[PDB]
Design a protein around this ligand. Structure first.
Ligand code: P9N
Ligand code: P9N
Ligand code: P9N
Ligand code: P9N
Ligand code: P9N
Ligand code: NAG
Ligand code: NAG
Ligand code: NAG
Ligand code: NAG
Ligand code: D12
Ligand code: D12
Ligand code: D12
Ligand code: D12
Ligand code: D12
Ligand code: OCT
Ligand code: OCT
Ligand code: OCT
Ligand code: OCT
Ligand code: OCT
Ligand code: OCT
Ligand code: OCT
Ligand code: OCT
Ligand code: OCT
Ligand code: HEX
Ligand code: HEX
Ligand code: HEX
Ligand code: HEX
Ligand code: HEX
Ligand code: HEX
Ligand code: HEX
Ligand code: HEX
Ligand code: HEX
Ligand code: HEX
Lengths: 336, 336, 336, 336, 336
C-alpha cells in the first residue's frame, strides 16, 4: 500500500509544519485559462484558472532506492495538511468534478509537495460609466489565507512576475483585454491581525468607432438636415412646418432607440448630453421660423391696413453652424 | 493529537453550556463585505458578510505552559456545541467552500471560543413605488436563534453600535446607500415563547436629475411646442392640422418609450399622471383649432349667403400657459 | 448522554407507532412567512412557510424528576420515526441549511413530540386570462402523506381554521392577496387506496385603474380625435387625408406598444377586441371621406361638362358617436 | 427488526434474480402529473410523472401467519437489487426529496415487489416552424434500461395501452395537448447489443384565430387602404404623395412590431412571405402614381409649348384587387 | 459475493497497471447524442455524449468455467483504478444520476475492462462576427488526461476515424451542422511535461436567404423609392419635401428595428456599412432638391427684379443609380 510508506497514523496532521517555530513559506503559481462572462449591471466577472501550491513537509518523507515521485488524487487531501486559500471579494465559486475531482498531489522523496486544482471563481468589480463610451475600467483578483496570519504562514509569488501565464486566445465579446501584472500588499484585520494578499490586475477597453457610428453620426446628420429650412422661401408654410415637426419626431425616435440599446445604468452620461443638446438645437430651429412667420403676417396686415429674405434667416444661417461647431469643440476638448 | 487535549469523549456536547442554570450569553459581530444585487420586481436584495460569535465554555479548557491558542477548521464543529443562528425572512443562502469550508474556530486556554464563517444571504424587502422616482426605501436584515428561547440563550451585540463595519467601496449601480445602524427587539412565538432578534438597517435613494432629464424635459418641450399653432394664421389649415397630429404622435411615442424603460410595476405613479396631463393638454390644443376653423367657415358661408385674429386664439394664448403653470405648481407642491 | 435516556437500540423505529392497531393521528400547523414570486407564463408560484407536526409515541418516554423537556436537532431524525409528508403538484422544493439544518425536535416526558422545519416550495396553478385585465384567479397548496393510507395514518388540522397564520406584511408587486382559508378532502389512488389531503386557499386580484389609464384612455382619445375631420371643409384634401393616415399610424403604434408590454399569452383577450374595434372605426373614418371626395369630383365634372356641407358628413357626425356609445354599452354590459 | 425477516446478509444482491437463466420480466406503469414548461428556442419540454416497477424476487420471501405486506422507504434500496431505468435523450432530471426521498417499496409475502418514485425530467424535441403559425408538432418520451440487454432484462408495458394515465387538468399556456398513446420498439447498440425501449407520444397545436387577428388582419387592411389613392383627383399631389409614404411607414412599423413578438427562429416562414408581398404591393401603389404625375406634367408642357381620369388609374382600379385576390387564393391553397 | 472473485484486498489500486514499466494504452470511443444550446454573446456551446474507455488489467482476472462476463455499477469505481479523463477549456459539466448514476463497468475473464458513462459538458468557442451574416465558425471539443503524462498513460482513438458516431437527428435552431472529424495533437506543460490530447471538430453555417430578405430588401426598396422625387415637378414643394423627410424617418426606423433584433456584439459589421451607405444616399437625395429649390427661387427673383426640367434633376437621374450599382458591385465583390 502506497499510503503505508508515509507514516500517516504516526503524525498529527491538524497542525501546520514547523509548529511553534518560524512561519512556513508557501509559493503560488497561477495560469489563467479563459474569461467566461462579464456583467455590467451587477459589476462582476467570471474567470477559470489553475491554482498551484509549493511547500515542504518533512513528515511526508519516505525512503526510496531511486528519485521517482508518487502521485495521489484528491482522496489523500483529507488525511494531510493543505493550505486553506480562498478568494477575497468573491460571490460564488466551485471546483470541477468531471469525471472526477480535478485535484492532484505529487510528493517528492525529501518531502516537497505540489498541490494543483482547477477552479472557477466570480469576483466583484466596481465600475464607473461617467465617461461612457470612452471609459476605462480596471479589475483585480485577490488571494489570501483564511485562518493563518503572517506569523504562521508566509505567502508569496514563487517566481515574481513570471508566475502568471495567460492563454493566447483569451478574449471578450465587447471588451479589449491588456496589461496583465501582479502585485502584493499586506492587509490588517482587527479581529486576528495581519495577512498577506496577492493581486492579479488587468484593464478593459471598448470599441470607439462602433459607438461613434451608431450614435454620433445620426444625431449630427439630423442637426445638419434641420438647417435646410433656412434656405427655403418663407412663403411656403406647409413645407416649412412639417419638415421641422418631422425632424423633431425623427430625433425623438432616434434618442429612444439609442437609449433602448444601452445597459441600464441610471445616471447621466456624456452621450445623453450630446443628444439633448442636439434636441434643443432642433427645437430652436422651429421657434425661429415660427417668429419669422408671425412677423411677416404682422407686417403684411399693417401694410394692408395702411392703404426678399428676412434678416432672421440671414443671421441664423451663420449663427447656428458656428454655435454647433463651438459646442463640439468644447465637448471634444473636455472629454478628449 | 490536538483533539485529545480537549476531553471530547468525556462530555455530552448535545446540551448547551450551563444546562439547568442561567442563560449563556452570546456576542455577535458583523462585517459587511459587499452588496451583490437588488431586484425591484421580486423585492429582495443580496448581501455577503462575515459572521462572528463569542461565548465561553469551561468544558473546552486545556492545560498549557503558555498563553498560546489552538486553531481548528470546520471539521471540529460536528464534535462540539455551536449556536444555531439563522436569518429571518430569507429566501436562499449558502456558505462558501472554496477551496475549503470558510469556517474557523479558535479556543483559548480558559475556554473562550471564537467562531467565524463567511455567508451570502438573500432577504426580502417590501417596497412602495407610489412616489417614484422620488421614493425612499428602507431595508433590514434580521438574525435570530432558531431553537433556543431567551431563557436558555441570550443574544446581544458585543460592542453596541461599534459591532457593525462596512467596506469603504460598497456601492450599487442605480441606488445610493447611507445610514447604517443596528437595533434590537424581542419577538414572541405562540408555539415556543420569546426570542431575541437583531437588526441591520440602511436606506436607499435614487438619482433625481437623470430621471428628470430623461422624462420631464421632453414632455414639457412638447407641450410648449404644441402652443406654436396659436401664432400661425388661421387660413393655413394644411399647416395647422398636420402640426397638431404629428405632435400627438410624438407625444404618444415618447410616452410609450418612457413606459418601456421602467420596471414592470402595475400601479399608478406620479410620472404617469404628469404624462397623461400633458397628453390631455395636447389633445385640447387640437380641439381648439378645430372649432376655430368650423366657426370661420360658418361665418364666411353666412356672409356669402347674405350678398384679423380670432378671439379664441387671443384668449388661448394666455389661458394655456397659466393653466399649465398652475398645474405644475400644484404638482410640485404635493410631491415636493 | 441524552440519547441513552431514550432506548433507541431497544426498539425498531422502522415501523409506525401502534403498528397492527388503529391509525395514529397526526396534527399539522402551518405559518406562512412570505410569497416570493409568481410566474404567469409558466403558471406557478413560490411560498416559504413553517411546517409543524404533532403526535405521541410511548417508546420515547423517559423518566424525569421534573417536567422539563429535551430539545434535539435534525441529527436525531434519522434514528426515530417521523411522518413522510410531501407537497402535491409541486415542481421544486428544498430545506434551508444555514447555518445548519432548520430542523427542531422536542420530546415531552410522556412521549409527546413536536417536529418543526422551514421549507420553500413551488407549486403549479392553472390560470385563465380570458377576462384580462378583469380576471380573478384562485390558487391552492396541498399536503398529503406519501406512503401511508388513512388506515395507518390519520391527518387533520390540529385547531381547525385556527391552524393557519399569515404574516402581516405579505404582499405581491402586481397582485392583491385576500381570503385565506383551509379545507380538507379525501383522495383515491387505484394503486394503494385512499389518502387524506389538506388545502390552503387564497385569491388574487389586479389593479383595474392602472390598466384602464394605460390602455383604454389612449384608444378612446384617438377614436374621438378621428372624428375631427367631419367638421373640416371638404375642399381641403391635403388637410383631410394626412390627418386620417397619421391617425391610423398612431393607432397602429399604440396597439403595438400595448401588445409589447403584456404577458405572452397566445389567445384572444377583451382588450384586443376593444383595440381592433377602434382600429376598424378609424379605417371607416377614412373610407367615408374617400367616397365623399370621389362624389364631389364626379358632380363637379358633370356640371362642367353640362355647360354647403355634404349629406354624408351630416349623417356621419351623428352616426359614428352613437354607434361607438352603443358598442361601449354592450361591451361593458358583457364584461361588467 | 423488520430487515432481519429478509435474509439480507445471506444473499448476493449485486446480481439480477434468476442469474444464468431466462431473462426476468419487468412491468412499468406511468402516471403523468403535469407539464411544466416548453422552450421553442432550445426545443425541449419538462414533465413531472410517477414511475412504477413490478417484478418478482424469491430471495425476498419471508414467512407470515397472514397476508399483510411490509412497506419500506428509500433507505432499503441500497441493500437490494433494483432496475436501473433511465430516460433517453434527456437533458436534466432529479428526484424530489421534500420532506424526504419520494421512494416507496412494498414487498409481498411470496416475493412480489412494488417500486415507485416521483421524478421530473427534461427531454429534447426537434421542431419545424416552416408552416408557422399553422404547424403541428409531435413529441416523445423514452424509457430504456442502461446496462441490461434483452437477454437479461425484459421490459414491457404491464397493461398495454391502459398503463398510461394523465391528469384531468393538464394544460399549456400557448399549446393544445391531445392524443396520448404508447408504443414499443427495439434499439441496437454496436457496443453491447439490443435493448427494449418504450415511448409516450402526444401532439401539440396552436390557436389559429389569435395569430390571424394579430397579423393577417392589419396587413390586409393596410393593403386595402393603399388603394384609396386611385379614387382621388390626380391634381392633388400634396394629398396623393403623403398618403402613400405614410402607408409605407405604417406597413414598415407593423412588420417590425410583428417580428418583435415572434420567437427568434432564423429561417423563412409563410407569414413573412405574406407581409413582404403586401409591402411590394404598397410600393407599386406609389410607383404607379409617380409615373401618372410624370406623364401628366409632360403632356401639359407639350400642350403649352404647342401654343377626366387617366387610363392608368382606370386599369389599376381593376388590376390591383384581382391580383391580390389571386395571390390570396394561391397562398391559402398551398398552406391550407 | 461477486466482489470476492476479484482479489480487491490483495492489491494496491492507487497505482496504475504496469507501474515502473511501459505506459498503459487506453482507447476512447465517443458517441454524440445531441446539441443542447449555443450562446453567441458568451461564446460557448453545450453537448451531451457517451464516453467509453478500453484498457486491460491483469489484477482483475478471475477464474471461470465459461466465457461469461460480470457487470458492475458505479459503486465499484471507488475500489479500482480508472483513468482520470477531463475536458479542456470547459466551463461546467455534470454526470446524470437519474434514477441512479449512469456508470457501467464490464470485466472480462482475462482482465479486459469496459468503462462507460453519460456526461453533459459546456465548452468555450471563440467566434468572429466580422463577416456577419456571411460568417463561418469552427468549434472543437478536447479530451486530455489530468495527472498522467505520455510516459505513464498513452491515449489514442481506438478505431481511428470510426470511433466517432453522431445521432441522425442532431440539429440546431439557427445553425447548420456539418463536417464531423477527429484529430490528435501533443500538448506541453512546463510544470509536468507532455500530454496527449484529442479533438472533435465541426462547422456551423447560417441561413443566408432569411437575413437577405429581412435586411437587404427593405433598404434597397427604400433607396429606390427615394429616387421618385427626381420625376416630380419642381414647383410642388409641399409634395417634394415631406416625401424626403418621411423617407428619412422610415429609413431610421428600419435601421433601428434591424439593430434591435441582432445579437449584442459591439463592433462594426458589413450589414451596418450597407445600411449607413443607404442612409447617406437618402440624405443626399434631399440636399439635391434643397439646392434646386434655392436656385430656382434666386433665378425667379432676379428675373422679376430685371423687369422645363432643371439640369440638376436630369443629371441626378443618371448619376444616382449608377453610383448605387457601382457600390453594390464593389460590396458584393469584397464580401462575396
Ligand atoms: C411674438 C412672436 O414672434 C411669437 C411667435 C411664436 C411665439 C411663441 C410660440 C410658443 C409659445 C406660445 C405661448 O402661448 C407663449 C410663449 C411662446 C414661447 C411664444 C412666444 C411668442 C412667439 C415667439
Ligand atoms: C361646433 C364646433 O366648433 C365643432 C368643431 C370640432 C367639433 C368636435 C370634433 C370632435 C367630435 C366629433 C363628434 O362627431 C362630435 C363631438 C366632437 C367633440 C365635436 C364637437 C363640435 C366641435 C367642437
Ligand atoms: C365609388 C366610391 O365612392 C369610391 C371612393 C373610394 C372607393 C374605395 C377605395 C378603396 C378600394 C379600392 C379598390 O380599387 C376598390 C374597392 C374600394 C373599397 C373602393 C370602392 C369604391 C369607393 C368607395
Ligand atoms: C418614365 C416614368 O414614368 C417615370 C416616373 C417615375 C420613374 C421611376 C422612379 C423611380 C426610379 C428612379 C430612377 O432614377 C430611375 C428608375 C425609376 C424606377 C424610375 C423609372 C421611370 C419612371 C417610372
Ligand atoms: C447654396 C445652396 O444651394 C444651399 C441650398 C441648401 C443649402 C445647405 C442646407 C444645409 C446646410 C445649412 C447651413 O446653414 C449651411 C450649410 C448647408 C449644408 C447649406 C449649404 C448651402 C445650400 C446647399
Ligand atoms: C514585483 C514586480 O516586479 N512588479 C512589477 C510591477 O511593478 C510592474 O508594474 C509590472 C509591469 O507593469 O511588472 C511587475
Ligand atoms: C372546516 C371549516 O370550518 N372550514 C371553514 C370554511 O368552510 C369557510 O369557508 C372558511 C371561511 O370562509 O372558514 C373555514
Ligand atoms: C400496442 C397497442 O395496442 N398500441 C395502440 C396503438 O397502435 C394505437 O395507435 C393507440 C391509439 O391510437 O392505442 C395503442
Ligand atoms: C487520422 C485521420 O485519418 N484523420 C482524418 C483527417 O485527416 C481527415 O481530414 C478527416 C476527414 O476530413 O478524416 C479523418
Ligand atoms: C443657438 C441659438 C441661435 C439663435 C440665433 C438667433 C438669430 C437672430 C437674428 C436676429 C437679427 C435681427
Ligand atoms: C386648459 C383648457 C384651456 C381652454 C381655453 C379656452 C379659451 C376659450 C376662449 C373663448 C373666448 C370667447
Ligand atoms: C359605424 C359605421 C358608420 C357608417 C355611417 C355611414 C353614414 C352614411 C350617410 C349617407 C346619407 C345619404
Ligand atoms: C400587381 C401589379 C399591378 C400593375 C398594374 C399596372 C396597370 C397599367 C395600366 C396601363 C394602361 C395603359
Ligand atoms: C452619389 C452622389 C451623386 C451626386 C449627383 C450630383 C449631380 C449634379 C449635376 C450638376 C449638373 C450641372
Ligand atoms: C466612422 C463614423 C464616424 C462618425 C463621426 C461623428 C463625429 C461627430
Ligand atoms: C470638430 C471636432 C474637433 C475635435 C477637437 C479635439 C481636440 C483634442
Ligand atoms: C437637468 C434637466 C432638468 C429638467 C427640468 C424639468 C422640469 C419640469
Ligand atoms: C414651476 C415649478 C415650481 C416649483 C415649486 C416647488 C415648491 C416646493
Ligand atoms: C359608457 C359606459 C357605460 C357603462 C355601463 C356599465 C353597466 C354595468
Ligand atoms: C378573427 C380575425 C379574422 C381575420 C381574417 C384575415 C384573413 C386574411
Ligand atoms: C380568399 C380566401 C380563399 C381561401 C380558399 C381556401 C381553399 C382551401
Ligand atoms: C429573397 C430576398 C432577396 C433580397 C435581395 C437583396 C439584394 C440587395
Ligand atoms: C448587383 C449585384 C452584383 C453581384 C456580383 C457578385 C460577384 C461575385
Ligand atoms: C448636465 C447636462 C445638461 C444637459 C442639458 C440638455
Ligand atoms: C431661436 C431664436 C428666435 C428669435 C426670434 C426673434
Ligand atoms: C389619478 C390620476 C388621474 C390622471 C388623469 C389623466
Ligand atoms: C379647448 C376648448 C375649445 C373651446 C371652443 C369654444
Ligand atoms: C371575436 C373578436 C372579434 C374582433 C373583430 C375585430
Ligand atoms: C364608411 C361608410 C361610407 C359610405 C359611403 C357611401
Ligand atoms: C420565397 C419568399 C419570397 C418572398 C418575396 C417577397
Ligand atoms: C406599377 C406599374 C406602373 C406602370 C407605369 C406605366
Ligand atoms: C468603415 C465603415 C464606414 C461606414 C460609413 C457610412
Ligand atoms: C447632392 C449634391 C447636390 C449638389 C448641388 C449643386
Amino acid at each position: 500500500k502506497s499510503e503505508q510508506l508515509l507514516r500517516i497514523d504516526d503524525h498529527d496532521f491538524s497542525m501546520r509544519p514547523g509548529f511553534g517555530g518560524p512561519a512556513i513559506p508557501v509559493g503560488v503559481d497561477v495560469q489563467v485559462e479563459s474569461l467566461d462572462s462579464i456583467s455590467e449591471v451587477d459589476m462582476d466577472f467570471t474567470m477559470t484558472l489553475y491554482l498551484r501550491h509549493y511547500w515542504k513537509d518533512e513528515r511526508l518523507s519516505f525512503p526510496s532506492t531511486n528519485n521517482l515521485s508518487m502521485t495521489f488524487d484528491g482522496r489523500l487531501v483529507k488525511k494531510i495538511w493543505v493550505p486553506d486559500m480562498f478568494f477575497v471579494h468573491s460571490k460564488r465559486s466551485f471546483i470541477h468534478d468531471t469525471t472526477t475531482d480535478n485535484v492532484m498531489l505529487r510528493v517528492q522523496p525529501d518531502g516537497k509537495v505540489l498541490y494543483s486544482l482547477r477552479v472557477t471563481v466570480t469576483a466583484m468589480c466596481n465600475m464607473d460609466f461617467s465617461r461612457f463610451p470612452l471609459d476605462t475600467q480596471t479589475c483585480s483578483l485577490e488571494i489570501e489565507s483564511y485562518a493563518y496570519t503572517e506569523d504562521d504562514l508566509m505567502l508569496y509569488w514563487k517566481k515574481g512576475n513570471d508566475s502568471l501565464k495567460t492563454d493566447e486566445r483569451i478574449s471578450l465579446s465587447q471588451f479589449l483585454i491588456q496589461e496583465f501584472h501582479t502585485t502584493t500588499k499586506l492587509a490588517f484585520y482587527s479581529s486576528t491581525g495581519w495577512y498577506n494578499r496577492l493581486y492579479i490586475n488587468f484593464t478593459l477597453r471598448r470599441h470607439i468607432f462602433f459607438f461613434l457610428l451608431q450614435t454620433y453620426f445620426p444625431a449630427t446628420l439630423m442637426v445638419m438636415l434641420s438647417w435646410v429650412s433656412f434656405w427655403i422661401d418663407r412663403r411656403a408654410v406647409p413645407a416649412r412646418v412639417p419638415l421641422g415637426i418631422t425632424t423633431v419626431l425623427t430625433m425623438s425616435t432616434i434618442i429612444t432607440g439609442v437609449n433602448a440599446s444601452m445597459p441600464r445604468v441610471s445616471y447621466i452620461k456624456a452621450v445623453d448630453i450630446y443628444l439633448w443638446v442636439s434636441f434643443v438645437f432642433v427645437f430652436l430651429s422651429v421657434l425661429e421660423y415660427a417668429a419669422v412667420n408671425y412677423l411677416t403676417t404682422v407686417q403684411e396686415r399693417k401694410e394692408q391696413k395702411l392703404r426678399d429674405t428676412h434678416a432672421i434667416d440671414k443671421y441664423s444661417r451663420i449663427i447656428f453652424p458656428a454655435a454647433y461647431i463651438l459646442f463640439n469643440l468644447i465637448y471634444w476638448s473636455i472629454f478628449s
